[PDB]
Design a protein around this ligand. Structure first.
Ligand SMILES: NC(=O)C1=CN([C@@H]2O[C@H](COP(=O)(O)OP(=O)(O)OC[C@H]3O[C@@H](n4cnc5c(N)ncnc54)[C@H](O)[C@@H]3O)[C@@H](O)[C@H]2O)C=CC1
Ligand SMILES: CCCCCCc1ccn(Cc2cccc(N)c2C)c(=O)c1
Ligand code: NA
Length: 404
């Protein structure tokens, strides 16, 4: 059986960790669950939840909160690679395998669909799943993060860009491989790259989802949907909020209105763009700015007692705003969970440290240690009480997994 099993260690290829540890991912999922159950149940939550992008990061945390905080039956959709012999699957695959296992232990429904959520096919499989099992869903979480989209009608492949708009920008960053503070310049996005980014990360596909569920009649009265967004501090504004990715996020703000209008006449349902804080994710070393900003932010927020990851954010988002008696609303009608990051004193401290960090003082000025630990945690590595010396079978299976 040693030929079918292997010792799995991190392998970092060009800022991407290309391995994932199944036992560690299970431990990470369990830790997120134990957080939710320790904090306690959430009153008045949805009971039948569809999460689009349910295998990692914020969508995973939404699934865990819905299931183990609100007691929801959950249907998840994601796009992940199964493990095979000699070849660890993606962290999201192992995460979902662990979710299904823990859901069943607690007697909660868990079914998942692995495939392209941008396609009509997957929307159909999802509809069919709800009809057979749930009747309808009360809540739809939209949490896809993707670099590309195949348009379901036209077949066109759109690619997102992470560029400023207008002028080129100098962005200070941390190269996590060489452990050097260094700057690079990004050229402004072309109108074409802006439209492509809005096609991928804007709100059309979210619309196509809520319309497809409606046209099939699988949405309960008083239903609710939310898509996640990031606004960030002024230091991220040039590249994020006012760049190509921010153009996409602003498209979401123009989608959420037609969404809310349709659900509000439908038993007083509701729809909101929800704004969340920056966290370490699979794509954090997309641009070396993110690791530097996270390392700084983690240190500052830890000194204030306010540091959080995905599960802490989404638990509050559900308890305070999605299901709570005091929604934390902004001037635009967005739900906000990100205010501890945007606190003026935090921004100021992060901004002051930003111009001071050098190769020599990274560990004295920042929580780069913490960034690295959370980044490895995502793939199931560096976790407490996991025996990393033991052989493991990378081919972990998932019951009630529809493969599309
Ligand atoms: N990571 C961060 O600091 C923040 C992210 N957000 C927003 O939260 C949302 C979730 O992002 P993360 O948690 O970072 O992403 P992530 O990479 O952890 O997860 C994205 C999910 O999308 C799924 N997915 C990607 N392409 C898909 C496809 N074609 N079809 C089906 N599933 C697909 C992945 O399987 C995964 O379940 C995004 O809208 C992001 O912009 C909001 C605030 C900050
Ligand atoms: C400089 C770091 C500040 C940005 C951190 C918050 C953040 C981090 C990741 N993402 C997802 C994302 C951001 C940028 C490019 C791409 N492709 C994707 C999927 C967000 O939307 C938001
Ligand atoms: Na997600």
């Amino acid at each position: 059986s040693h030929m079918l099993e292997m010792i799995i260690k991190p392998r970092v290829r060009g800022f991407i960790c290309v391995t994932a540890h199944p036992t560690g991912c299970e431990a990470n999922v369990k830790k997120q669950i134990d957080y939710v159950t320790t904090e306690g149940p959430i009153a008045n939550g949805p009971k039948r939840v569809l999460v689009i992008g349910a295998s990692t990061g914020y969508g995973l945390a939404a699934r865990i909160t819905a299931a183990f905080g609100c007691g929801a039956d959950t249907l998840g959709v994601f796009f992940e690679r199964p493990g095979e012999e000699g070849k660890p699957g993606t962290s999201g695959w192992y995460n979902s395998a662990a979710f299904h296992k823990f859901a069943a232990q607690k007697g909660l429904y868990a079914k998942s669909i692995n495939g392209d959520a941008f396609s009509d096919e997957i929307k159909q499989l999802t509809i069919d799943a709800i009809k057979q099992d749930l009747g309808q869903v009360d809540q739809v979480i939209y949490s896809l993060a993707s670099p590309r989209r195949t348009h379901p009608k036209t077949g066109e492949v759109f690619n997102s860009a992470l560029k400023p708009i207008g002028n080129a920008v100098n962005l200070r960053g941390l190269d996590t491989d060489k452990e050097v503070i260094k700057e690079s310049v990004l050229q402004p996005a072309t109108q074409s790259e802006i439209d492509s980014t809005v096609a991928v990360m804007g709100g059309e596909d979210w619309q196509m989802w809520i319309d497809a569920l409606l046209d099939a009649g699988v949405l309960a009265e008083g239903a609710q949907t939310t898509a996640f967004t990031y606004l960030g501090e002024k230091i991220t504004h040039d590249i994020y909020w006012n760049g190509s990715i921010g153009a996409a996020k602003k498209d979401l703000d123009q989608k959420v209105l037609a969404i809310r209008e349709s659900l509000a006449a439908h038993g007083g349902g509701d729809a909101r763009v929800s704004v969340l804080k920056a966290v370490v994710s699979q794509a954090s070393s997309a641009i070396p700015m993110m690791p530097l900003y996270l390392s700084l932010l983690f240190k500052v927020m830890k000194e204030k007692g306010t540091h959080e990851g995905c599960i802490e954010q989404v638990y509050s988002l559900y308890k305070d705003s999605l299901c709570g008696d005091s929604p934390h609303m902004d001037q635009e009608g967005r739900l906000r969970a990100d205010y501890k990051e945007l606190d003026p004193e935090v921004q100021n401290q992060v901004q002051q440290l930003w111009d001071q960090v050098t190769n020599d003082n990274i560990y004295q000025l920042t929580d780069f240690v913490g960034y690295k630990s959370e980044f490895l945690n995502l793939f199931g590595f560096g976790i407490d009480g996991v025996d990393y010396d033991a052989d493991v079978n990378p081919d972990v299976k998932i019951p009630n997994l529809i493969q599309g």
